[PDB]
Symmetry: C2
Subunit: 416 residues, 2 copies
């Protein structure tokens, strides 16, 4: 029972007519979909849970359709958003559509027979749809009375100053019609998404009934919350030019103990039995948990590949050990991007001024004392001379020196 | 000052930035518009007040644009309407558009130089507009918080069972864009309509500022109410003679209450305000109801219509029917007097029973013998009488009257 398997992983928030859907899944393969709007040049970790759920359905023999919102991205989803978004240009949205489509594709199998994945774009049917056709054929089936009362937009109708445009208010209809289109085009009978999408999904179920006289289903995945109550992202992009593999890997390494097993269930393809054995091992080891290391390895390999995972571990190992000889120029570029705090400095700066400019020390007088106390390392090597100037060999690849005050305060000097 | 002149006739419900509009009108001709949606094959008396208002602006030298809602008629205006309307087909709406455009055209001058009237249809811009273009270029300028607070749709936003579809809720944006579109195409700076249109007009004023950075204005005419509190023109009083005959039209006006007659001359005629006031004091039989009937009937149905209406009225009052033509009897059968269809050979007693002028043959016999019945205005007191062929006027019609005023028209099969 796929729904029950997803429920044990904590991956089912809500499901329409669960018995009928489970009966349909057990009968044979179904086609299902999940949509992703282009609001940026990359997806982030928030988008990964439903994307990986498409794969989980596919591994059970179902056919996933990954829709990218070429049209909906020109409108903007208001669902549980406190503020009206500015409209994006057609040129920017198209550039983002191509990037997202390409980023999504490796997570799904496009070559596994009948249930091979399908890439879809709702601009195909909205780009040539007349406004009177939309208002009459689609709009007549929507009650404004019900629409203004949906949880996703109700808060936006409290104050005019923090209100909602007719553009964003119409979004629900567009996503509604997409479900009817995919049902007609590919026999799609299930739509999945995060729990904020419930109302957009159910409008599609109701419209598919009205337009195509077909019974279709909805299933949502919970939005991730941490046990402490704080917000999940602290955003973590899938694109390495936005969030380096090192920072990505470190984010998972630093997962709280109360979230690590749930995150393994949400973000990995490890069996429930293995995750339960990992939790049990951590419970009776007599040591701190090792699950964070397993979670970091799994998700980093999934998103950034074996090469990305090895680069994340090599940077982590070098930063910890102090020995930087194993680092490449590309590794230092991850560090400069977002790995450790960084500063740009003109070559010839003494150690004292590097400490002040890097904000590792408030003044040169303070810098002098901390150097003399043997609290500073240069590329992991201790340097106790206050009057010290860096040697040309300490500027790695001619432009990198890593300063560390104590055991954990880093600043990468990027020489100009 | 034209606004002052309209206020004196009681034709101004509301007006935006009034000093500026009066100033714009005073410096020279403006282009203005009023829209009419196709919800039937004819306009009715309710539509006459803003229609004549376009002509009142045109006489003052302004350029009227008469818009027929070929696109808006496919959506449906919910303004102050208690219930959602069913969608009409594209084929039906197109038939109504052509009938309404042709009914409006004689009320305005399409050949008077610079200020010649223009017929417009919003299907010309909405019929091929892409949905994303509409939602982005127009929809972004509309606040749902503001829309749900418009007086015209409030009664519809309390309960789902007396609710509003997304279709009718989007209407306000189409009428809003129409004003912006007419401002760009023809330099239209004023929109008029009845008071129910206030919110649709003010949305157009706001959108024109947002889209074209132009200042435009709105003016509404009051919805006609009676002194007694009842509904005006109550079914409806249509402009189409095949729906409401010129006789029935004329009679409706003759029977206007004295408390409404002077206000109605101001709203429905081109008579000067000086003339109407002079007519008001003089009544302290009033000739006003007769003057109102004469003016509006001539305006809608022409001199030929007015003469037929007067000719039928006169023949029914006198009982002398020789002046009635075949077409006059056709007006009587349509809606002029109660009518009953009958097979030729029916006796007088049967005609009185079938027409419901008498409850039984035995009673009809007593009524006929009492000299209460006229056949085409001639007394007939033989209870056993059968109609003569010459009494079937144009081989089709016989008018019975019981007593001094109860008529029934027999239409022979
Ligand atoms: N309206 C959806 C995209 C969509 C869906 C179906 C269509 O037919 C058309 C468009 C939307 O705006 N999605 S999203 O791009 O913001 O996110 C994609 C998915 O990721 C989930 N998500 C997003 C952010 C987050 O932190 N957590 C989360 O689960 C959302 O619920 C959605 O299912
Ligand atoms: N929404 C308007 C038509 C319209 C106007 C402007 C546009 O850009 C597009 C469409 C509408 O539905 N009008 S109506 O066809 O119902 O009536 C036409 C006019 O007659 C007035 N009217 C209607 C009935 C009545 O009893 N009294 C009255 O004054 C209305 O206020 C409107 O100005
Ligand atoms: Cl006879």
């Amino acid at each position: 029972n796929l729904i029950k398997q997803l429920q044990e992983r904590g991956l089912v928030a809500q499901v329409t007519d669960e018995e009928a859907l489970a009966e349909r899944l057990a009968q044979g393969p179904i086609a299902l979909y999940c949509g992703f709007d282009p609001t940026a040049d990359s997806l982030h970790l928030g988008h990964l849970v439903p994307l990986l759920c498409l794969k989980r359905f596919q591994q059970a023999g179902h056919k996933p359709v990954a829709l990218v919102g070429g049209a909906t991205g020109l409108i903007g989803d208001p669902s549980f958003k406190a503020a009206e978004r500015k409209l994006n240009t057609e040129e920017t949205v198209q550039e983002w559509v191509d990037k997202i489509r390409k980023q999504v594709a490796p997570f799904l199998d496009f070559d596994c027979g009948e249930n091979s994945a399908i890439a879809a774009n709702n601009y195909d049917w909205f780009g040539n749809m007349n406004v009177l056709t939309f208002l009459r054929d689609i709009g007549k089936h929507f009650s404004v009375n019900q629409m203004i009362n949906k949880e996703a937009v109700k808060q936006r109708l409290n104050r005019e100053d923090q209100g909602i445009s007719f553009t964003e208010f119409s979004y629900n209809l567009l996503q509604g019609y997409d479900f009817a289109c995919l049902n007609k085009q590919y026999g799609v009978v299930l739509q999945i998404g995060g729990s904020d999408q419930w109302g957009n999904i159910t409008s599609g179920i109701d419209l598919t009934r009205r337009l195509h006289q077909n019974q279709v289903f909805g299933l949502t995945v919970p939005l991730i919350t941490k046990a402490d109550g704080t917000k999940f992202g602290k955003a973590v992009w899938l694109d390495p030019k936005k969030t380096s593999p090192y920072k990505f890997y470190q984010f998972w390494i630093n997962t709280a103990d109360a979230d690590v097993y749930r995150f393994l269930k949400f973000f990995t393809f490890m069996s429930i039995e293995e995750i339960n054995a990992l939790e049990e091992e951590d419970k009776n080891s007599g040591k701190a948990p090792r699950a964070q290391y397993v979670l970091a390895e799994q998700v980093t390999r999934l998103v950034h590949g074996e090469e990305g995972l090895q680069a994340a571990k090599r940077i982590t190992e070098c930063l910890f050990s102090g020995s930087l000889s194993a680092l490449s120029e590309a590794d230092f570029e991850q560090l400069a991007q977002d790995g450790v705090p960084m500063v740009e400095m003109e070559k010839g700066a003494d150690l004292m001024q590097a400490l002040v400019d890097s904000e590792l020390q408030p003044s040169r007088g303070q810098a002098r004392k901390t150097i003399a106390s043997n609290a500073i390392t240069i590329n992991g090597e201790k340097q106790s001379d206050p009057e010290y100037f860096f040697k040309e060999e300490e500027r790695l690849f001619g432009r990198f020196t890593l300063l560390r005050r104590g055991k954990k305060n880093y600043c990468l000097i990027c020489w100009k």
